[PDB]
Amino acid sequence: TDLSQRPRRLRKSPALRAMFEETTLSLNDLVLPIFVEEEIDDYKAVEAMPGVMRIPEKHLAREIERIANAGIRSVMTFGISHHTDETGSDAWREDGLVARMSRICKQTVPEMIVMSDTCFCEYTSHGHCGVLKEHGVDNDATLENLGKQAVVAAAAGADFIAPSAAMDGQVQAIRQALDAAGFKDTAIMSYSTKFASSFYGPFREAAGSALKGDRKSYQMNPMNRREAIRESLLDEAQGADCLMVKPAGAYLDIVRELRERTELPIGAYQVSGEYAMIKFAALAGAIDEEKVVLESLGSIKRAGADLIFSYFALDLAEKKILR
Amino acid sequence: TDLSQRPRRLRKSPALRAMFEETTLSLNDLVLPIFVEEEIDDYKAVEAMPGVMRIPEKHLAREIERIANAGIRSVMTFGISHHTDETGSDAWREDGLVARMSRICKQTVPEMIVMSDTCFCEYTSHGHCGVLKEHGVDNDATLENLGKQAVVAAAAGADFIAPSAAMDGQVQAIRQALDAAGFKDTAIMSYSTKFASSFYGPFREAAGSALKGDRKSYQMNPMNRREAIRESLLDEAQGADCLMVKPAGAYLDIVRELRERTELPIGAYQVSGEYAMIKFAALAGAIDEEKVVLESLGSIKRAGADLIFSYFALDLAEKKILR
Amino acid sequence: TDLSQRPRRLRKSPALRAMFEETTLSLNDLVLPIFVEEEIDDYKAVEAMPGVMRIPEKHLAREIERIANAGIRSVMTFGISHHTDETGSDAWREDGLVARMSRICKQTVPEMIVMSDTCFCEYTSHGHCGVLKEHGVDNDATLENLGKQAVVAAAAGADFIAPSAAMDGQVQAIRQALDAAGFKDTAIMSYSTKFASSFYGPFREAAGSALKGDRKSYQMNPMNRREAIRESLLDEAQGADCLMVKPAGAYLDIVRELRERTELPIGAYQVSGEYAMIKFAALAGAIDEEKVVLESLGSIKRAGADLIFSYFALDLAEKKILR
Amino acid sequence: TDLSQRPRRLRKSPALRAMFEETTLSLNDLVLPIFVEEEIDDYKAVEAMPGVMRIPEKHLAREIERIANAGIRSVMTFGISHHTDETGSDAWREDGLVARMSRICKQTVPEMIVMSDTCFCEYTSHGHCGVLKEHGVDNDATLENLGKQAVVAAAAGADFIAPSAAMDGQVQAIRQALDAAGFKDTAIMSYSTKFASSFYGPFREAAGSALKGDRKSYQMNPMNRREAIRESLLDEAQGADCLMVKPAGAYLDIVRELRERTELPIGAYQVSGEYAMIKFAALAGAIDEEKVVLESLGSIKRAGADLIFSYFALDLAEKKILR
Amino acid sequence: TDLSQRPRRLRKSPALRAMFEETTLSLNDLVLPIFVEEEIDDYKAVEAMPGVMRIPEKHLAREIERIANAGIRSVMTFGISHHTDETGSDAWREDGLVARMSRICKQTVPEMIVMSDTCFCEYTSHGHCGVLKEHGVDNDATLENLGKQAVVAAAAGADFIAPSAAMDGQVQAIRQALDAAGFKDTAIMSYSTKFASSFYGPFREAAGSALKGDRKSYQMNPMNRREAIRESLLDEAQGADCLMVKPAGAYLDIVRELRERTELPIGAYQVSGEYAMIKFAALAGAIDEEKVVLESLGSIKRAGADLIFSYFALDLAEKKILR
Amino acid sequence: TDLSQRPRRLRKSPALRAMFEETTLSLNDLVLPIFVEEEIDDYKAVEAMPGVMRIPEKHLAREIERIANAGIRSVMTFGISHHTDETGSDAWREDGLVARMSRICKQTVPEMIVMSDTCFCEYTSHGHCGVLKEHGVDNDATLENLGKQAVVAAAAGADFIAPSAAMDGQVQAIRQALDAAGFKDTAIMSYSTKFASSFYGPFREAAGSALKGDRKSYQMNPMNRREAIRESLLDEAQGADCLMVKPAGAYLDIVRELRERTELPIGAYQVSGEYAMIKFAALAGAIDEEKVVLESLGSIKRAGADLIFSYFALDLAEKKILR
Ligand SMILES: [Zn+2]
Ligand SMILES: [Zn+2]
Ligand SMILES: [Zn+2]
Ligand SMILES: [Zn+2]
Ligand SMILES: [Zn+2]
Numbered sequence A, B, C, D, E, F: 001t002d003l004s005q006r007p008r009r010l011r012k013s014p015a016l017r018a019m020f021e022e023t024t025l026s027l028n029d030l031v032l033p034i035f036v037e038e039e040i041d042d043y044k045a046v047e048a049m050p051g052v053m054r055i056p057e058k059h060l061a062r063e064i065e066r067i068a069n070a071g072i073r074s075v076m077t078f079g080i081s082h083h084t085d086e087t088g089s090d091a092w093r094e095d096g097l098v099a100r101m102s103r104i105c106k107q108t109v110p111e112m113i114v115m116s117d118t119c120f121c122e123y124t125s126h127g128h129c130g131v132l133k134e135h136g137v138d139n140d141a142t143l144e145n146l147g148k149q150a151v152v153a154a155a156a157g158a159d160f161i162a163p164s165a166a167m168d169g170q171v172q173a174i175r176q177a178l179d180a181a182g183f184k185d186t187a188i189m190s191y192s193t194k195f196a197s198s199f200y201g202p203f204r205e206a207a208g209s210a211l212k213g214d215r216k217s218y219q220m221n222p223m224n225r226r227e228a229i230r231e232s233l234l235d236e237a238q239g240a241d242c243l244m245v246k247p248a249g250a251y252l253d254i255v256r257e258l259r260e261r262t263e264l265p266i267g268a269y270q271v272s273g274e275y276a277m278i279k280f281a282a283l284a285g286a287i288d289e290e291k292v293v294l295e296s297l298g299s300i301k302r303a304g305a306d307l308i309f310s311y312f313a314l315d316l317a318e319k320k321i322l323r
């Protein structure tokens, strides 16, 4: 046929596809979320997240070292509390779980980039991402607490404070608190664009949030693309060091549009539900796990994400699939 | 706190979120892919696609009518051949399965928008999307065949010829053939941007493609965002009536960028692997199926897709979840 | 003929046009403006707005419930005052008509999204949208009053305070007042871009504004497209939750340009004159009312409006034309 | 208050608003559509278009001269046929009504810019905009006829051939025919973007189209903004001298987007329904006719239209409202 | 100090800089240019390119295998001729050096991506990049020869024909010739934007071009950024598979602008002069070679290049600096 | 051949290339960096920068006058300290080397545009660009010092204070200090985008910085293009009069992108390593020095730089190569 343009010419062999591959994926793009449960002896399996375990705080220095050894550059800590209360106050206690996870990680592996998930859903009685009032989850009371938590987390060693409560002004609030507390160097990995997604099922079982109801009054509507960009831009305006889109998998268009709207780094969260959809389909033999994971992750990088939070990170590292 | 901007104000209640919801999803956005197997009496279950059946050609007029009755506007037909050969020649026989699926659908429900998947992977001995030569899958020999198939499919009643073989110049080739054959009114739903994705596992079991190897020499690299846009733009240049991104789920950034690069309609394919990841995780209780499906689909619409090919379409229609 | 591109292929049938229809319209896009007259027993017909009635305040809880029952998500309240004065002070009385409309609506149907029109034209002796001085309608004195009104309206239950006085700094003024008064959660639906349009005739008879003269010193010039965009952007800068273009019908280009200039929601007002032009032509048999309304409204949505204020809303809801 | 930005400063008086008025409107922007009925003695009133008359062909030279005298620069001729047939063949007869309207106008007022509406809806038995086949309104057979009509219209004196049949490739077809026929200098005022609008009611009664059914298979969907732009761009590609959006009133966003997408002139049609909505509301006293017309027209110019087809043109000219 | 924004926070340690590093460099980005001299026994050292040798054709299969073994994906072949003539006709002889380099490389390592430099400067008596006439270097006579050379090179095994003669229409000419000759699958790596740079000194000594004078009548002006982009876009229009900017080092702005103007792959040539500037400064101890090379190369990738032609490639591969 | 477009037509002769040359280079684009060592009698040769000498402070008025006489418009002063300490306090002493270089230059040649390099690497014991603490190079303590230095430098006659320490908020800090000190007219030539480049080797030997380690915690990653643009934009936001990209040679894409992102002037630094790479290759005879320098410099101007800091400046001026 008379076709001057033939894109298939650069797909002829593996070598050519590698020369022309536009996106790369490596361990430098991954952040390992880790679940730490205090006051427990044995690792707990998160059934809805095949292969994922809750780390007993007592095995934490061992795990972090294992994580570090695999080449993992950073982790996002998530705690399973045995000290919840109406406001998740343990989150801001100098020696609450939040601080200890951070402190243990950083003392054990000082070059480990520790990100502290900053919220209250895992420490509150009601399971909401903040202070519960009769109007719902009070924005401003939560901000104060986030700020307090940030200072203790930073004091404990966290390199990034990562607010995931979806509260308005949370980056500003936490930045002021860190600065005032003397932690001007502590970064903020904002969960800038966080949707009220149905892809968080598994997480609830993993992290222990007691929430009976939803977070639609704070987490934004999955359908809102313009709002999603504005959400993250407000965060850049409030000084966040890195922004983030969560979930990432079904939101690659948001990741791409945000990438074209800011020079800030952009993180992308491959949520528990994404991880579970892959594991369960792979377990059923419907798909090849390794291929789907890499494509999934590569897709997130293609969309423009500088960092990806993935529960597969350690396994990819250990199996040497990524380096 | 002093926050003049509070995005949470429009997330306060369900009514407010509905007023402000930026994206809509309805039956007008869905296309039902259907699998028809010739020469069989009973429906066959596609194990890797829980809930999906191969329709015996003899039950086809009944199914299509059922599909139509649910409010489904259109279907994409896929055949399971009992007459394969080195070139998938049944695909171009006036009365091959391709034609019959189309003819049966259109005679039974004349207002049904019939899209014919136009390829050879389901009719060839080797399972490749075309004519197999010593150089691999010959582009040009395939184009001629696609063209022949398009004419018989169109002659049979197909409203859209949908080339999914990933061959270069396929839209041009098929358009010339339809025009010359007198089917100037027959549209082309190009699978313009089709990646060599690992999300097609289930499909192979559903549609019967005999391929032992891969399609990387024709289907494009999942990592290639610039090439992906160029792929579809070449298709617009060749006259396609509608373009398409496939898979869709992990390619929403591509869908969004393409949407900003063309005024043509854009279809998006929620592949078998996507459908399987949701079904299997839902079966394991890790996620809520209905919520994940709607979010998944709504996300594809948010990204900019005018149409979505989803295996969930009939179920959403029948259960009245979408109208 | 040799035409590779044939847009008519996707216009062939109703099914195809529905699959390809780029814009949707539903009850989630409509806001019902409602006219409430205090101290009256019977509904009053607004002659210049066939089918539109002034609701006696005493029938208000009944109407709102009717409105809610039809599926209407929100209303914009407009009062007809029997207590006007040089400054429209009833507008800011804790129990003035403004507050009562809001309170009645919200107590009767708590999930009803109440927007309070915030102005003084309906409460002043002179009929102007504010405080009348020798220089004309004093901007700053009006701002103070708007702020006072906003607090009582919010205190009364309004979800949105909607300033329609066209005063400079009105969003800022009202936001400060709400915040200081403790109504940080109360939104602002700014009538950001409001022209000095000739399409408001009917309104004057509906709402009772006593104005003898014009509002050209505050409402902006219909011809000013650049100013129109700047008007709304200043409003976004002052914190408005939603912006608005009014009128909408003859200003769809403004709606479209604003949509490309902000991520904020955008409301569009199908003014009384638009509603009257359609009703009267339809009454004369020159056009089909239902078709013209839907096209009119669909056009406003096509232009980019997230919400439309339309006097047809209830009728479309009740007749089940939109859902 | 402390407001550095005060847009109201330039709205203070009429002089200031005139200095700052961003859009102008004059007789140089208007095209008068004219309705000419052959074989009739008296002017016929178009009831659905108060003030609009069908001109008997015998009074045509008088009217055109009147039109010219008022300062009107150009007219769009529309005929009411007493010689219809299955194909509207009178439209292409050397001396059919189409030619005569043009010839009479140009001989009587040689500097008059004559635009010939080029279609068949007014000359066919069935009332469709073209050749009726079993598939509907055949595109290609219509194109041939349009071309024939264009040559006779051009031969007769028309300066612009204005295809309003909404057929694909109509500009290309008509350009080839004019060129081949030796009318390379004859322009094409394409009705590039013409929607299947409900605002054409009155027209049917004015122009006499016998259509019982709709034109949705050729006129495009009112909701389709992307398609609308593509429609006009294809026309620019086919060589149109001027493009057009019709209707104009509820499509100002389309006018604006097209203006930013082409350097070609853009015409905008204030359809019969628009004209009727204004007349009827004005007749009912709901609005001020003159103000609404000028705002309506000024809005169309604001949106970016270089020319407007308005039935008010002569009246505005004669009353000296525009010059 | 009160600084909310602190970019230094993500530069704190090596781990953080690696997480945030925006650009990657690997062996998949490199193409090794190789110099092959026919009819010689020993490797010849190119004095102006420390570490670079001319490979005797007889050691070629050994070198290519060595190159392949190091992980190098592709090479650009350059010949040193012992059969020059007024037109460089050996370049098009079925068994000229050009063909043999290609054939030897591909037979020895079939998966090696062979790019053939396509020009005549190394085969002509006068040393110019083409056919020398009294007007200078005849464009069109050169095009014919390039085409002939391309066919023999492709016939010999080259995967890419890489025209570096800077002739107008060279991509078009070579594409037609390959297609006509039946090498439709053979790609074209155009040296689309090639400046008349002073950075090619060393090359002349390496490749043996006999030119006494300059190439300013064909190679474009180093100062011309607009022309440089147009040069490459014309090449995309003529069908090139990949474009290229050469030199690359002092032209990163061109690389970046081209990257934003095309979806095609972009190669970038780190010319001999660049390689020599680094080697000589490193030899003098003024800079660290390895760091400068990687920064140099990383910079080219940062600018947007998909591939880089670098003489350091093999050394980086062998020393395991890149993988 | 049939080629309508022939770019070679404007490359035919030197006259045509000069008419069409898109970029110019002159002495008005150059800034001469100068190295002044206090307390020394003889000029010292910087071995890693052939031709570059350290000027003894006592010969400074002679050199500056020589520099001025050659037509050089401005210089960037760099001192070699014989009074270093833990904080580089001499830099802020009223009569420290920094002040004296400036004072000597401006008194000797009052119209000379003096830019003072503002940092501490040349005055600190440890060689870092600031105050060394246990956390590394303290940002804020450095800012205070920079500010102090700026005032004494400005007081001494510097026209531009040029912070090259890569500290966050350095422009803001220095602007406040100058303003408060009464030097509101003193400009700031920020080294806005300064990478942690390996091209600074030679400089260390020239300027005497004692640093044993690296500056990666303050100078930004060479690979970071988005951060690089943000770095400079923050500087514009802090009030810098001119921005700068350093190094320039391997960062022309950054220069170009910044040029399209700001209206501020942009300086570009051709670092010592660039100067050394050219000198050493030229010394080895691998390239022509004069041609490479001019191309190098012209390339920097092509990329969009308004000013270039080049060590070749005086030589080009004196040899009359540029005027
Ligand atoms: Zn305990
Ligand atoms: Zn939470
Ligand atoms: Zn937020
Ligand atoms: Zn059979
Ligand atoms: Zn296939």
Ligand SMILES: [Zn+2]
Pocket: B166, B167, B168, B169, B192, B231, B232, B234, B235
């Ligand atoms: Zn393709």
Ligand SMILES: [Zn+2]
Pocket: C039, C082, C083
């Ligand atoms: Zn009363």
Ligand SMILES: [Zn+2]
Pocket: C119, C120, C121, C122, C128, C129, C164, C165
């Ligand atoms: Zn008012």
Ligand SMILES: [Zn+2]
Pocket: C166, C167, C168, C169, C192, C231, C232, C234, C235
């Ligand atoms: Zn305003």
Ligand SMILES: [Zn+2]
Pocket: D039, D082, D083
């Ligand atoms: Zn007759």
Ligand SMILES: [Zn+2]
Pocket: D119, D120, D121, D122, D128, D129, D164, D165
């Ligand atoms: Zn018609």
Ligand SMILES: [Zn+2]
Pocket: D166, D167, D168, D169, D192, D231, D232, D234, D235
């Ligand atoms: Zn058209």
Ligand SMILES: [Zn+2]
Pocket: E039, E082, E083
């Ligand atoms: Zn020989």
Ligand SMILES: [Zn+2]
Pocket: E119, E120, E121, E122, E128, E129, E164, E165
């Ligand atoms: Zn050459």
Ligand SMILES: [Zn+2]
Pocket: E166, E167, E168, E169, E192, E231, E232, E234, E235
């Ligand atoms: Zn060229």
Ligand SMILES: [Zn+2]
Pocket: F039, F082, F083
């Ligand atoms: Zn001393």
Ligand SMILES: [Zn+2]
Pocket: F119, F120, F121, F122, F128, F129, F164, F165
């Ligand atoms: Zn320094």
Ligand SMILES: [Zn+2]
Pocket: F166, F167, F168, F169, F192, F231, F232, F234, F235
């Ligand atoms: Zn900086």
